[PDB]
Each structure stands twice: as C-alpha cells, then as structure tokens.
Amino acid sequence: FAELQGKWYTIVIAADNLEKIEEGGPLRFYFRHIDCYKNCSEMEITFYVITNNQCSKTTVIGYLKGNGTYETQFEGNNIFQPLYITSDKIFFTNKNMDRAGQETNMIVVAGKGNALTPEENEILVQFAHEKKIPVENILNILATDTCPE
C-alpha cells in the first residue's frame, strides 16, 4: 500500500446510491494527495468537497486494520481498500455508513489527471459488475474538479 503515496485526482466515482455522488452529494470528493505513514498503516488523504457552495479543503486519516481495510470517519464511517494499483491509477472500493445508518457501496478511481483509457474503463466495468454497482452510476468527476490545485 506504500504505492498509494503522492499527488492524485478523482477521475471517476461509481456508487449504488447515486445521489451520494452527484453534485451536492456528500461523497463527491476531489482528491489532491495521499501521504503514507508507518508502511502506509496510516493514510492521510487530502481532498476537496463542496460544502455550502464553497470549496472546502479537507484532510482525514485512514487507519489500516488487521483485515487489510482502512477505516476513516467522514460523512459517516468509511471502510475502504485498494482493489488495483498502477503507477498512474488507483481503483478503490469504499463502503460508507452514514449517520442515519444507510450503507453506500462505491468505487473510486484516482489518477494523475487524465481521463481513463479504454482498458482502464474495462477494468472499472469489471469491478462495477463484481461489486453490483450499475454501470449507469459511473460518474465523470474529473470534468467538474473546479477547486484550487
């Protein structure tokens, strides 16, 4: 998981509860950076979300557990882990349990800046099928990444 360290942007996000990741949704986030500590057992994530119609730069810490997942508190409880890592992309799975108890299953693809290639899109589709997330719920987040670098 040490391969997680560096500058990253959110390229695509897919979720079973689509309203969570559309504009205005609490889980629509725009990565900026991941810093790893202690052989990446602590993963600090820096990102932007829009809150009250303003860009809100945020940091949270993901804590690695014995089961190989990371837990972080943000808009509820999150349980996430990399599904597949390359030098220019990270495909993560995340399960969010909000404060009402609603569970949302998501796939987040982080990248260095470019849109996904055809092969990367195929990998994403295979993951969406495996996780039971509709392909019509795959959103292009890079297109609306408007907050400061």
Residues 18 and 4: their CA atoms lie apart, in Å, by: 26
Q: Is the dihedral of CA 125, 110, 70, 104 positive or negative?
A: negative
Nearest Cα residue to 141 out of 13, 25, 34: 13
Residues 120 and 85: their CA atoms lie apart, in Å, by: 11
Nearest Cα residue to 47 out of 16, 87, 92: 92
Helix (H, G, I), strand (E, B) or coil at 128: helix
Two tokens at 87?
Answer: 């030098």
Helix (H, G, I), strand (E, B) or coil at 4: helix
Determination technique for this entry? X-ray
Count of domains forming the chain: 1
Please, what is the end-to-end C-alpha distance for the chain in angstroms?
A: 24
Give, in order, the Cα–Cα distances in Å from 97 to each of 39, 101, 105, 130. 27, 6, 9, 20
CB 21 within 8 Å of CB 10: no
Q: How many CB atoms lie within 10 A of CB 129?
A: 11
The side-by-side arrangement of strands in the sheet containing 138-140 is 6-7, 30-37, 42-51, 54-64, 70-73, 77-85, 89-97, 103-111, 9-15, 138-140
For residue 33, what are the domain limits?
Answer: 1-149
Residues whose CB falls within 8 Å of the CB of residue 45, separated by 6 or more in sequence, listed in order: 31, 33, 34, 59, 60, 61, 62, 72
Partners of 144 in beta bridges:
none
The CATH number covering residue 39 comes to: 2.40.128.20
